[PDB]
RNA sequence: CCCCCCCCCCCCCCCCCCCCCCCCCCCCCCCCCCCCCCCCCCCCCC
């Protein structure tokens, strides 16, 4: 029962409220308890409460005296309780309350007038209850109420008189989800003075009931409308006609199993701004299917189309000119589809597009020809995602039509080819290119020579070839910042590989084979491939097979902060290597063969750090090899994990395993 | 120039013979020298020589005085020299010689009588010379000569008078290989009193010349005849008619490119005993093709048939009943063929067969049905080799017709199935079964229950499955001796796996995964799967991932001699484990993580050995961990390899790498 | 001036074997989360 400023009593299995807490407590949490009853006589001590979070209990009934002991209470949380009876005196004396949760309270019926006398409520919750009608009063009250929740109830009708108690209130959210509503009375929503947002998730409406609902929703100020999982199989040109007279902006059609969309279906929403079609079953989209949507600014189409079936091969076809009417479209999420491929004229008309995500959108986009993105010629694209598309090859001038492209994501593909360098033609302002997890790439001396402005390059588990060319392919990228070359089994790197990239900061080189490149027995001497990068910050060199350290590799990283040498084969290290790393922060040397750590090699490294990772090391417990290290450990401030569990010696056997 | 009893001077680049050797030397070797001449005046000291091996020199001429200094000389070796002139006085005074090599001596012509006066020669060599005729005398001499070599010469004729100088000699071997002989004079071999063996390798005879030769070889005592690489494309029923009148037993037809054999071709050799057809190009063998061979006891057919060609698919077909006439056949080597498969009645009639090798004999013998070996019903087979036949499956009762089979070799196949146990039915006296290098085998509780007499089982890199069954499959083999279970990645073994096999001696278990089976943290305790084998001798347990040693596994191997624990992960070992191994001979503990070896654990192991393998061990140089070991090394007799190269410590750094 | 016979030394190519490092895939576990189901005990409501 820890309590300093807020009080929490979750998972303590209380029976009665504690009598020993600070008087000035503002937050009181008593979830996951067994309070059969809540007498108010124990609330005399607590006279400064603001929040009362006592859900997940078995409280039978409440008394008005509790309102006397809490005159400044703000939140009354009563989820999952047995308050099956409500009266006027139940919430009478409480008038300063602004929150009221009655979720899963098994309330049967509202009798006369339980909430009339108080007016400071902003949100009312009545979810998972046994209510059959929305009758919560007779006269008008709850002027300040804006959100009403009535989901998961047993309501089957919405009569006009029922909402008459909100004749002068502004409704931001009217939650009526999962209630088997089968009819709508005329004028029921016109009884609401100001209706802004409406929710009917998991409500079995269907086509005709949606027609009648839209006819009812006419001449109101609605902006939000969610009809998710309403089993709306088909829409037509008159489905949302009643929404012509309003100014709706956000509309949801997720999980509705929408098989087909009629022509000019959404012509009655000129003011729509957001529109959601995730997880549908569309088989064919027509040309004028999205007509009248010249103001949509955000469209989601994740898994909106039918998956391929071997019985019929019902591949979802998208006709040409289909997105012409989305003049102000600014975002298109188009993931997890089974579209056979891109046509020549699909995305014409998007004059203000800024985002297109195509992650796993196509079953077989084998080749990226130079005519694939011609429909994106005038669209000012900035981010393109081409992940998990099973793309096999990229031809010349594939992205030449993307003039203002800045981010390209080609991860998790099946690209096996040689980068001739003509792919990035026309990318005059490109910044990032992602190419991780491909089949194989064989770079060329001028692979990235066509894009000076590139700053990022992700090449993890891509299995590069000919990276050891005499001219360095990464040299022309005169402003590169992040480079990842992990999981590639790279064996040879040249000394002139990375000069001129003065702003390079992050270099990840884990799980490779550079053991030969650093041992002095290598012909021509060890390769010094980390020279010239003045502003490098993050370096990852774990699992390389390194057995020796050339003394002048880290001599130019004047601002290095994060270095990683785990999973290596290092046993002894030459002294005076980390001298110029004046501000090293994170050193990771786990799962190595290190047997002796001492000052003249790791002193400047241990100058001012923040994290050390030296978990699985066979240390030798000897004053020549461990004494200075344990001296450094004894007084320290570095965040070092698992020091008392895995920092165990190996030899001599007398001190085997003793920290 | 080391010389104790024999003298060797090979690869010393001598100019003249040494003058300082023991007088009683019997063997004198001076190969690979530059002796321009060999004066006899330096041979006064050497008066007890028996062998004179002075080949690979540049000796111009010899003098008869050398014979005076060596009266008991036996061997005169003069390969590759410039003795282009021979006379009667050249080998006159030498009469006790019994060996004479004149290979590659560039001898042009034999003038009058160089070898007449001496008679103790048994072998005469004249290979790689420039002789044009076999004239080596006028009268009769060389009564005791038995082998004559005349290969790689420029002889083009064999006249009858030419061999008249051997009218009363027994010729065991007449080597005339690679001489372009184009005619044969009648009576040339009848001039030889007793001709036994004849060689004509690499001689362009062809069919008709072979006919004439056989007609000439009539009425002689020949036994050996090699016609290898004679470009004999075709034979007929009368090819060897002249050999009817002799008693030939061994005949060679290797490398002759024999495309087809006529019917009843070998009907003229009732006394043949050995017969060689390796590396031929036979396309089709007829029924009566081997008629008249009822006495052949050893036949070689390695690569005797045509390989498959995609142009025509000329698969070599063997007709049925083809081996019926080989009544006394005792050995058939039948490797490296491209036979499509075995027919139902191929090997009938072999009443005394004892060996059939079928290594890589068939391109696609996918299934071993129960009717494959029906033709081998009455043949007393003892060894069968079925290696590299790409056999995919073995069905029930496949070897049921091999009543007296003792060895079965099924290695290097593609067998992926489950051994139901019915395969070995009828093998009432089987001893060894080899099954290494297969795809996958899944044993059954009664896989080997049908053959009590089995003694060997090779299962290397076979990837066994369900070896951890509750009843042990290897239990019924009540006399097993050798078991190999390497390269299988076996993970689980039961404690009741190998009881009752009291005579088991060799058990190889390398490159597996038994790390869990021995660590004490395993549920149920470590598995003691080596209990009961009283007479085990050879054990291989390298590369298993072992990290701990249960103390009572090697307690019953009272006669163990060879144990292997290399490539493991052992770091420290519990004491008193090798107590009962009173006669351990070979201990292999290379490439481990051992850091301390000392007496109470390895003392009884180091009692009386013969070989220790502890090459790559990270030792800890400390008197608690290395002092007793180096004490044991300092005085020893065990054959321990590479002690001064790889026995280097790891910690502390002061003694890193110092032996 | 030509053709051959060597001895010695230095390179190139191919094949085989062995060793080290690493990657990918798979197997045997062990651990931490997520979800579902079943069972036991206790406290209440209708």
Residue numbers in the entry:
A (entry chain B), B (entry chain A): 29 to 687
What is the paper's account of this structure, in its own sentences?
Toll-like Receptor 3 (TLR3) plays a key role in anti-viral defenses by inducing a potent immune response against double-stranded RNAs (dsRNAs) produced by viral infection. Previous crystallographic studies show that RNA ligand binds to the extracellular domains of TLR3 and induces the formation of a homodimer of TLR326. The charge interaction with the phosphate backbone of the RNA double helix plays the principal role in the interaction. The ligand-binding site involves both the N and C-terminal parts of the TLR3 ectodomain.
Close inspection of the region between the TLR3 dimeric units in the cluster shows that the charge interaction plays a role in the clustering. The closest contact area between the dimeric TLR3 units is composed of the negatively charged N-terminal and the positively charged C-terminal residues of the neighboring ectoTLR3 dimers. To test their role in TLR3 clustering, we made two charge-reversion mutations. The N-terminal mutant, NT-mut had a triple mutation of K117D, K139D and K145D and the C-terminal mutant, CT-mut had a triple mutation of D523K, D524K and E527K of ectoTLR3. For the cryo-EM study, the mutant ectoTLR3 domains were produced and mixed with poly(I:C). The micrographs of the resulting complexes show that the clustering of ectoTLR3 is significantly reduced or entirely blocked by the mutations. The dimeric structure of the mutant ectoTLR3 is still superimposable with that of the wild-type ectoTLR3. Therefore, the effect of the mutation is not due to a conformational change of the TLR3 nor the blocking of TLR3 dimerization. The mutant protein is still able to generate an intracellular signal in response to poly(I:C). This result indicates that the charge interaction between the TLR3 dimers contributes to but is not the predominant factor for clustering under the cellular environment where TLR3s are bound to the membrane.
